[PDB]
Ligand binder design. Structure first.
Ligand SMILES: [Mn+2]
Ligand SMILES: [Mn+2]
Ligand code: NA
Length: 612
C-alpha cells in the first residue's frame, strides 16, 4: 500500500485476516476489495455465533421463531426466489464439448456452457460493489468428515446470514475447518444476494434477491463457484450441488472416483449381516423416505448415512467406499408425514430451519400431504404470509419448500456415518416414477448393462416423462458421454469389486390410476431381495430387461393380495417403444461422445425385446 484501500483488517468484526492461511486471506481480501462489504465476519462455527445470528435475523424480520418446537425457525422467501434455477446455472470451460456433448439435432439438456469471456462480462455487471452496506461472512467448511481422506474443504463468502445458518447445518463449518486446512487447496465459493445498500429495488418479504441477474456459475479449472442473485438452497448453499456434485464430479473424473446424486443407507438382516446401498432417484421419488425408512419386516434394520450425495472411491482392496459429504438433510417438506417418513418427523422438531412452509397459530409447521389434523381453534398461515384454509385451491406450502436439519439428530443415523474410511457399497439402485410398463424391481445383467440402466433413466415430472440419467441431469459437472466412459472404466480397475446394480419403480399404476405397490416401509421387501441377490441367492428369473424376482421370491406376507402379474408385467410393445426413445435420446443428446459399450447395451436390449 501507498494508500489505505487494499488492507481490509480494520473491517474485520470476528477473527483476524492475519491468522488465516495465505491463500484464504487473498481470497477474502480480493473479494472484499471487489464487493465492498461494510464488515467482514470470519465464522467460528460456534453455538454462540449461531444463536446470536438467528436472533438478529429474527430482529430484522428475516426469520421467525417457531414456538412449538425446540430452537426451530421459519423463513418465507420472495416468491421469485423459491428453487434452483437451471436456466441460470452454467459451467465455464475453454471448450464447450468438455462441459456438454454437442447434440445432433436439438438443444442440450445435459448442461449449460458459458464461455469464459461471456462469464467475465456477466461477473463485471454484477459483483463490483455488491455487498455495500453488508457483512461479508467467511464460511470455512468441510464436505465430509474432518480428516477423511475423501473430504474436501471449501471457503464460502456470502452476504446472507440465512446462508451462514443453513451452512452450519448442511456442512461442517468453523475454526476447526481452518486449522485442518492449513496451506492446503480449497474450493473458492463466492455468493451475493445482489442487493447492495442502499436498495435500488423493493425488498419483498424481507428476502434479499435479484431474480433478473441470477447466475450460478462453476469454473472447475479455477476451482471456483460464483453465484449471484438468489438466496435459495441450491443456488446459495454452495457446498451442496455446486460443490458436491458439479465441481466434485469433475475432480472425481480427474482423480478416479465418483461424486453422485445418491442416498446411502445401511441395511441389517435378522442374522446380524449388514450391507450398504446407494440409490439415485430423480424428483418426487422418495430418496429421503428410503434413506430413513422404517422397515416393516421383523428383524430388519435400516440406518441412514446420507439422503442426497455420495462420494465414492475404490480402496486398495477393491471395495467401493462411500462417504456422505453433507452434515445435514435438506429435504422436501410437503408429503413428509408419520406414515411416509416417521424418522424425519423425529429429526425436524429440534434445531431445524424451515423454508416456505405454512405456520400454525400455536407456532407449528404445516404442509400439503402432512397427515396431521389440527385441534379446533388452531389456524394456518400459508408460506405467503396469508390466512389459509384447506378449502383454498392454492397450497399452504410451496411445493419446493424445505426443512434443513442436522444429520446427527436422525434417530436412525448410521454409527459409521462419519467414519473417515467411508462405508463399503455392495449395491447401487436407480429408479424413477413410471406409471406404466416398468416392473417394481429388476437387476442389471452386468456392469455395462447397469451403466446403461443408469443412462436410460426416465421419470414422470398432461403429464410428461423426462430423462434424468443417473438422476444427475441438472448436475453433470462435465460431458455426460465422458461421465459414462468414466463409469465404464471402473470395470477395468484391478481388484475392483463392482456393486450389483438394480432398478426400482415404486410408482407403477393399474388401468384406473391406482398404485400397484404400497411402498414406504414395505419397500424393505424389495431391499430384502436385493440383499439376497448380492449374497448370490438363486432368487432371480432372466427377462429381456434384466433379472426379476422368481415366483414367491419376494416376501409379501402381511400385505394383502398384491397384483404381482401387473407389477412385474413386461410387455413387448411397451419395451419396443421404450428402447426406440432411449436410442433417439442418446443419439441426439450424447451423439459423438456415446461410449461404444452403451451403444452395444442398447443394441443388446433391442435384440432381446425383438425375440419375445
Ligand atoms: Mn438432491
Ligand atoms: Mn470395457
Ligand atoms: Na421473509
Amino acid at each position: 500500500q501507498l494508500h489505505n484501500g487494499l488492507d481490509f483488517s480494520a473491517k474485520v468484526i470476528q477473527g483476524s485476516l492475519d491468522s488465516l492461511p495465505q491463500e484464504v486471506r487473498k481470497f477474502v481480501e480480493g473479494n472484499a476489495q471487489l464487493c465492498q462489504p461494510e464488515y467482514i465476519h470470519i465464522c467460528d462455527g460456534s453455538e454462540e455465533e449461531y444463536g446470536r445470528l438467528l436472533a438478529h435475523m429474527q430482529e430484522e424480520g428475516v426469520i421467525r421463531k417457531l414456538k412449538k418446537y425446540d430452537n426451530c425457525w421459519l423463513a418465507l422467501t420472495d416468491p421469485r426466489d423459491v428453487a434452483r434455477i437451471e436456466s441460470k446455472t452454467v459451467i465455464i470451460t475453454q471448450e464447450q464439448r468438455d462441459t456438454v456433448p454437442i447434440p445432433k439435432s436439438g438443444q442440450s439438456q445435459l448442461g449449460r456452457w458459458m464461455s469464459e469471456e461471456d462469464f467475465e462480462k456477466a461477473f463485471n455487471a454484477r459483483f463490483p460493489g455488491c455487498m455495500k452496506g453488508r457483512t461479508m461472512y467467511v464460511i470455512p467448511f468441510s464436505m465430509g468428515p474432518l480428516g477423511s481422506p475423501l473430504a474436501k474443504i471449501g471457503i464460502e463468502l456470502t452476504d446472507s446470514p440465512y446462508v451462514v445458518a443453513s451452512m452450519r447445518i448442511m456442512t461442517r463449518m468453523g475454526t476447526s475447518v481452518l486449522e485442518a486446512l492449513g496451506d492446503g487447496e480449497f474450493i473458492k465459493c463466492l455468493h451475493s444476494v445482489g442487493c447492495p445498500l442502499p436498495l435500488k429495488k423493493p425488498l419483498v418479504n424481507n428476502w434479499a434477491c435479484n431474480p433478473e441477474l441470477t447466475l450460478i456459475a462453476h469454473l472447475p479449472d479455477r476451482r471456483e463457484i460464483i453465484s449471484f442473485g438468489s438466496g435459495y438452497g441450491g443456488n446459495s448453499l454452495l457446498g451442496k450441488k455446486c460443490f458436491a456434485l458439479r465441481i466434485a464430479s469433475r475432480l472425481a473424473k480427474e482423480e478416479g472416483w465418483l461424486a453422485e446424486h445418491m442416498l446411502i443407507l445401511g441395511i441389517t438382516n435378522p442374522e446380524g449381516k449388514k450391507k450398504y446401498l446407494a440409490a439415485a432417484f430423480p424428483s418426487a421419488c422418495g430418496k429421503t423416505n428410503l434413506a430413513m425408512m422404517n422397515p416393516t419386516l421383523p428383524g430388519w434394520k435400516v440406518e441412514c448415512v446420507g439422503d442426497d450425495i455420495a462420494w465414492m472411491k475404490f480402496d486398495a482392496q477393491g471395495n467401493l467406499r462411500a462417504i456422505n459429504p453433507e452434515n445435514g438433510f435438506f429435504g422436501v417438506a410437503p408429503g413428509t408425514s408419520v406414515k411416509t417418513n416417521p424418522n424425519a418427523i423425529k429429526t425436524i422438531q429440534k434445531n431445524t430451519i424451515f423454508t416456505n412452509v405454512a405456520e400454525t397459530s400455536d407456532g407449528g409447521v404445516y404442509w400439503e400431504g402432512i397427515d396431521e389434523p389440527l385441534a379446533p381453534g388452531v389456524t394456518i398461515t400459508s408460506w405467503k404470509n396469508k390466512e389459509w384454509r384447506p378449502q383454498d385451491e392454492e397450497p399452504c406450502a410451496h411445493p419446493n419448500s424445505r426443512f434443513c436439519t442436522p444429520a446427527s439428530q436422525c434417530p436412525i443415523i448410521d454409527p459409521a456415518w462419519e467414519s473417515p474410511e467411508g462405508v463399503p457399497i455392495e449395491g447401487i439402485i436407480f429408479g424413477g416414477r413410471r406409471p406404466a410398463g416398468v416392473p417394481l424391481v429388476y437387476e442389471a445383467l452386468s456392469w455395462q448393462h447397469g451403466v446403461f440402466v443408469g443412462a436410460a433413466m426416465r421419470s414422470e415430472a398432461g403429464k410428461v416423462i423426462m430423462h434424468d440419467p443417473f438422476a444427475m441431469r441438472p448436475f453433470f459437472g462435465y460431458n455426460f458421454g465422458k461421465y459414462l466412459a468414466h463409469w465404464l472404466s471402473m470395470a477395468h480397475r484391478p481388484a475392483a469389486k463392482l456393486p450389483k446394480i438394480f432398478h426400482v419403480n415404486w410408482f407403477r399404476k393399474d388401468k384406473n390410476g391406482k398404485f400397484l405397490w404400497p411402498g414406504f416401509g414395505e419397500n424393505s421387501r424389495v431391499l430384502e431381495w436385493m440383499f439376497g441377490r448380492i449374497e448370490g441367492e438363486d432368487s432371480a428369473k432372466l427377462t429381456p430387461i434384466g433379472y426379476v424376482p422368481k415366483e414367491d421370491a419376494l416376501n409379501l406376507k402381511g400385505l394383502g393380495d398384491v397384483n404381482v402379474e401387473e407389477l412385474f408385467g413386461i410387455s413387448k410393445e411397451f419395451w419396443e417403444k421404450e428402447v426406440e426413445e432411449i436410442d433417439k435420446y442418446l443419439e441426439d443428446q450424447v451423439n459423438a461422445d456415446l461410449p461404444y459399450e452403451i451403444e452395444r447395451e442398447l443394441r443388446a436390449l433391442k435384440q432381446r425385446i425383438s425375440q419375445m
